[PDB]
Amino acid sequence: ARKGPKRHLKRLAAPTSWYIERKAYKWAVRPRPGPHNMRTSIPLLYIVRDYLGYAKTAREARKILNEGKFLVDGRVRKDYKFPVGIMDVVSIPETGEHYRVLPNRIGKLILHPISEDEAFIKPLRIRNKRMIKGARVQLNFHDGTNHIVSIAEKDNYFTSYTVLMKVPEREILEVLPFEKGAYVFVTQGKNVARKGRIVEIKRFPMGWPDVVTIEDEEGELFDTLKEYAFVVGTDKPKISLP
Amino acid sequence: AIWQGRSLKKPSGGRIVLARKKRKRELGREPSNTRVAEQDKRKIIRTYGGNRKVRLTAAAYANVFDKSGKGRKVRIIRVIENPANRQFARRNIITKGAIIETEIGKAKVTSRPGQDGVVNAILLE
Amino acid sequence: MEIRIKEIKENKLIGRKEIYFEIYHPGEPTPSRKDVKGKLVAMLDLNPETTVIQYIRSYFGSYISKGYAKAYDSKERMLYIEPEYILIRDGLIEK
Amino acid sequence: RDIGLRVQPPAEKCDDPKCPWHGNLKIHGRVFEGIVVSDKPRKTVTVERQYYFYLNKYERYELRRSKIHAHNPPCINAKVGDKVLIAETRPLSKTKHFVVVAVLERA
Amino acid sequence: ATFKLVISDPKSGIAKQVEITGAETEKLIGKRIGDQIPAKELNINLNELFGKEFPEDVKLEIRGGTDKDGFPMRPDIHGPRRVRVLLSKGPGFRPKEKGERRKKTVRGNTISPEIVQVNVKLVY
RNA sequence: ACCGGCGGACGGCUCAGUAACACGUCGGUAACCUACCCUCGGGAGGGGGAUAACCCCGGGAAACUGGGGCUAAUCCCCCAUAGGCCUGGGGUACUGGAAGGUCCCCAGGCCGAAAGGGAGCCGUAAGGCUCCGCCCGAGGAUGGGCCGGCGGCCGAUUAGGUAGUUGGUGGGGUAACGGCCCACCAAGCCGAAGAUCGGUACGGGCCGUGAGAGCGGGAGCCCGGAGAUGGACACUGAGACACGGGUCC
Numbered sequence: 001a002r003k004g005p006k007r008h009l010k011r012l013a014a015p016t017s018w019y020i021e022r023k024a025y026k027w028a029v030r031p032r033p034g035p036h037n038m039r040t041s042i043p044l045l046y047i048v049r050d051y052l053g054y055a056k057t058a059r060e061a062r063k064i065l066n067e068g069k070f071l072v073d074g075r076v077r078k079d080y081k082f083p084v085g086i087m088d089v090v091s092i093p094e095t096g097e098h099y100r101v102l103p104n105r106i107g108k109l110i111l112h113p114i115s116e117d118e119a120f121i122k123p124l125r126i127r128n129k130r131m132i133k134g135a136r137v138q139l140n141f142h143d144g145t146n147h148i149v150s151i152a153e154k155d156n157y158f159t160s161y162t163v164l165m166k167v168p169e170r171e172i173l174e175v176l177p178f179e180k181g182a183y184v185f186v187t188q189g190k191n192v193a194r195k196g197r198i199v200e201i202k203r204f205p206m207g208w209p210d211v212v213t214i215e216d217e218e219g220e221l222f223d224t225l226k227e228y229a230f231v232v233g234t235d236k237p238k239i240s241l242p
Numbered sequence: 243a244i245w246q247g248r249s250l251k252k253p254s255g256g257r258i259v260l261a262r263k264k265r266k267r268e269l270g271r272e273p274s275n276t277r278v279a280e281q282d283k284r285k286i287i288r289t290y291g292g293n294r295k296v297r298l299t300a301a302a303y304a305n306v307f308d309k310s311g312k313g314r315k316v317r318i319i320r321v322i323e324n325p326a327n328r329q330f331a332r333r334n335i336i337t338k339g340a341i342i343e344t345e346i347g348k349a350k351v352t353s354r355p356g357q358d359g360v361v362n363a364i365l366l367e
Numbered sequence: 368m369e370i371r372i373k374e375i376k377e378n379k380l381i382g383r384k385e386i387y388f389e390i391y392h393p394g395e396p397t398p399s400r401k402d403v404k405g406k407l408v409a410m411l412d413l414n415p416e417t418t419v420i421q422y423i424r425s426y427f428g429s430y431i432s433k434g435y436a437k438a439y440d441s442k443e444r445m446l447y448i449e450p451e452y453i454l455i456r457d458g459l460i461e462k
Numbered sequence: 463r464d465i466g467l468r469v470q471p472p473a474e475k476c477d478d479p480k481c482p483w484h485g486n487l488k489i490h491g492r493v494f495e496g497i498v499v500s501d502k503p504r505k506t507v508t509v510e511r512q513y514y515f516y517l518n519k520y521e522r523y524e525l526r527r528s529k530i531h532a533h534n535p536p537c538i539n540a541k542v543g544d545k546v547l548i549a550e551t552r553p554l555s556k557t558k559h560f561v562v563v564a565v566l567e568r569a
Numbered sequence: 570a571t572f573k574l575v576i577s578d579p580k581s582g583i584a585k586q587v588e589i590t591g592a593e594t595e596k597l598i599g600k601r602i603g604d605q606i607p608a609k610e611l612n613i614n615l616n617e618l619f620g621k622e623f624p625e626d627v628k629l630e631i632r633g634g635t636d637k638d639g640f641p642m643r644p645d646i647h648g649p650r651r652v653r654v655l656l657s658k659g660p661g662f663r664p665k666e667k668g669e670r671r672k673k674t675v676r677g678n679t680i681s682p683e684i685v686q687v688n689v690k691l692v693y
Numbered sequence: 694a695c696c697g698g699c700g701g702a703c704g705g706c707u708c709a710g711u712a713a714c715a716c717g718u719c720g721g722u723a724a725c726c727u728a729c730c731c732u733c734g735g736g737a738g739g740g741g742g743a744u745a746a747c748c749c750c751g752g753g754a755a756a757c758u759g760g761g762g763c764u765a766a767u768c769c770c771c772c773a774u775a776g777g778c779c780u781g782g783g784g785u786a787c788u789g790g791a792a793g794g795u796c797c798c799c800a801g802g803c804c805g806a807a808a809g810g811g812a813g814c815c816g817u818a819a820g821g822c823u824c825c826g827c828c829c830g831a832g833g834a835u836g837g838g839c840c841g842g843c844g845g846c847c848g849a850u851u852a853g854g855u856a857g858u859u860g861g862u863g864g865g866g867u868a869a870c871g872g873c874c875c876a877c878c879a880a881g882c883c884g885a886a887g888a889u890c891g892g893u894a895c896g897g898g899c900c901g902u903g904a905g906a907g908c909g910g911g912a913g914c915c916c917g918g919a920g921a922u923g924g925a926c927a928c929u930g931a932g933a934c935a936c937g938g939g940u941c942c
């Protein structure tokens with residue numbers, strides 16, 4: 001009976017990472033394709049209306065968005081279906097507000113207030129590295145963003161590393177490597193929102209993912225996925241992560 | 243149409259009853275019996291997802307490559323032997339595994355003319 | 368009829384202020400929209416032409432009624448943002 | 463050469479393009495151990511794996527067997543009764559979707 | 570067999586309608602679409618009709634027509650026969666969609682006694 | 694009102710068919726397609742051509758529909774360059790658990806782009822700024838396609854079933870791997886641990902009952918699958934062989 005892509009999304013079938021009343025209404029905003037995945041993002045309409053309360057109805061929320069009063073990273077977004085994901089910076093210059101989108105201990109997305117000096121920095125985890133035409137190295141980040149560097153700097157970047165990029169100018173500030181003693185922040189799984197330092201890395205045969213052991217601030221050792229470990233510093237977190 | 247879906251018989255030997263109509267995405271197309279001729283003939287086919295395929299129906303030239311990487315464009319005379327089918331050699335039908343005779347000698351095809359639109363071959367030593 | 372302003376919030380994206388208040392009035396009917404707006408304007412020095420009462424709600428067996436109001440900076444902004452039906456209900460539009 | 467498994471490569475070599483060690487075939491997915499019960503078809507063996515299934519209501523186990531057809535590379539001439547290791551791969555025929563990668567024990 | 574001749578002047582964009590009863594209808598019968606004949610054997614003057622001074626070598630070219638049942642004539646259909654053809658473009662079909670095809674009834678190129686209206690163009 | 698663009702393949706309804714990779718779950722696609730959206734790196738050079746609307750004349754009971762003239766585009770077509778696809782010979786810079794993958798250097802070829810368009814504010818002009826836009830490459834994201842292991846129903850007053858069937862060697866076709874199909878070579882494959890055949894039935898989350906073990910149901914809500922009087926076919930489109938588009942019986 002299905003003949004093509006879906007365009008709707010019932011509230012009961014909404015992702016579990018949203019702070020949404022699943023039974024108040026029947027329909028939910030189907031997220032447009034964008035930077036992050038479905039499970040690590042929420043449409044900008046929900047952030048504008050439910051999370052912050054700046055609007056009561058979708059009509060006035062759309063009017064606010066069209067007036068260009070909301071900024072994601074450093075660029076103004078007018079699409080109410082635009083996804084906002086992990087490590088994103090939401091800026092409202094008219095009120096001077098800056099938030100970092102982060103998961104909480106039960107995997108739900110929340111906005112953590114930050115300062116103006118921190119609002120210009122967005123960490124990006126290198127999801128993949130490849131080559132393009134002309135012998136140039138292309139880096140693909142956790143939010144689907146891409147960067148291009150010369151072959152000379154091919155040894156300065158590797159997968160699972162973190163790049164601190166200044167937005168919206170898209171300039172690399174520094175690179176945090178993935179190694180022992182590096183501060184990390186777990187973004188998915190059972191140990192969401194937990195932070196600590198790398199202890200050991202275990203690799204397995206076949207296509208099974210690598211596992212990383214992290215020691216938290218209390219001395220407890222817990223395991224998680226290497227792709228779930230997000231480097232945020234060398235010895236201390238370079239961004240506010242509470 | 244040329245349905246390329248699931249088989250109608252189980253590996254044990256039982257019969258399978260279709261629970262749905264044939265889908266457009268599971269349909270193939272007629273074979274392109276690329277014949278040796280005097281002028282090349284090719285057509286463009288719009289495929290799944292709006293992609294493009296070049297179908298070569300008549301072939302008159304071939305790109306024959308040697309062991310040193312040198313390639314020459316020559317003319318096809320006849321299909322000496324086609325291991326794919328016992329009638330292709332006598333009907334002068336070029337496939338991927340065919341062996342052809344050109345101005346420089348015997349060549350073995352290495353491309354798929356029905357999917358490529360060109361004929362490429364390697365010299366036989 | 369005593370009005371207690373429980374909360375005032377300043378919306379700057381939409382140039383308005385949102386006022387949540389309560390009306391204590393035992394042994395009296397639910398106050399009219401005109402009277403509520405008049406008292407609220409007299410108390411908070413708001414502009415009568417840019418204030419709108421979203422709702423006044425009464426509850427079961429209660430002497431207090433909840434009320435929500437919005438005061439906009441400009442009449443043009445209020446017309447642009449607010450729906451037509453609420454303006455008609457509050458009497459700001461002759462329609 | 464290592465192809466993602468902690469097993470020794472075959473001693474000899476072959477020209478089969480479907481051999482994961484000396485060809486272009488790629489292994490990805492499940493890895494199973496079994497006993498060869500049939501090897502009559504060319505480059506094809508039948509692998510049998512035995513496991514116990516727990517019946518809740520009767521609180522008892524019942525024996526079940528799994529039969530899988532796998533490709534037999536010329537380097538690894540697995541015979542009937544051999545303890546064999548198979549790995550998942552892309553479809554090779556109507557019923558073959560695994561490939562023999564090593565012979566643990568010779569019958 | 571009577572005909573309604575729609576004569577169109579390409580150099581002015583005007584058209585005129587004339588009725589043919591029982592003599593020149595025979596003369597017109599049997600010709601296909603695209604056949605040119607002089608206007609002088611059709612028993613018509615063409616001068617006072619258009620208020621013009623057409624040259625002596627004026628001709629009528631049959632461009633189309635419709636029959637009794639209001640069906641058009643397709644130039645690509647041979648013979649004076651009425652058939653049903655799955656059409657996607659051309660005379661007798663208006664697509665109205667992107668790529669839809671509908672089966673319609675059209676007449677052949679040759680003129681038949683069943684034809685009612687014949688559309689022709691003046692050629693100098 | 695017309696041309697043109699997008700949507701109309703989602704939503705809404707039903708449980709007919711289906712004992713099957715249909716469904717549930719865990720894994721693969723290193724064997725595949727993807728319009729709308731996000732990021733980075735590049736481009737927008739030169740030409741041609743119809744026609745809708747409108748005017749004249751109409752045909753037909755209607756449904757529908759003919760001829761001529763005159764026009765524009767983000768409409769269509771052509772050239773060039775970028776670029777894609779195949780094959781042959783070399784270097785190993787990259788991701789990966791592992792390269793029929795990516796990248797770089799030669800060679801033979803085929804295919805082969807665009808709308809510097811629109812609006813606003815300035816500026817004497819030239820020119821400048823903002824917004825919405827067009828094409829190519831590399832990635833994502835979104836919706837799918839295909840594949841595997843495991844699980845879930847009764848009848849032996851149904852015991853043999855299969856012959857493109859099971860496997861291979863070479864190809865064709867497909868967006869993709871595959872007896873999906875073809876040519877050739879062998880006799881394989883399933884089965885008393887219930888084959889084949891017949892009966893019934895959309896599968897699951899769940900619902901009813903019972904102290905529990907268990908037994909029974911699985912219409913309403915959600916996810917997945919099918920169907921549009923019974924069938925079979927195709928056009929356009931990224932997506933259909935399409936409930937309110939098309940053809941035949």
Ligand SMILES: [Zn+2]
Nearest residue numbers: 476481484537
């Ligand atoms: Zn081998």
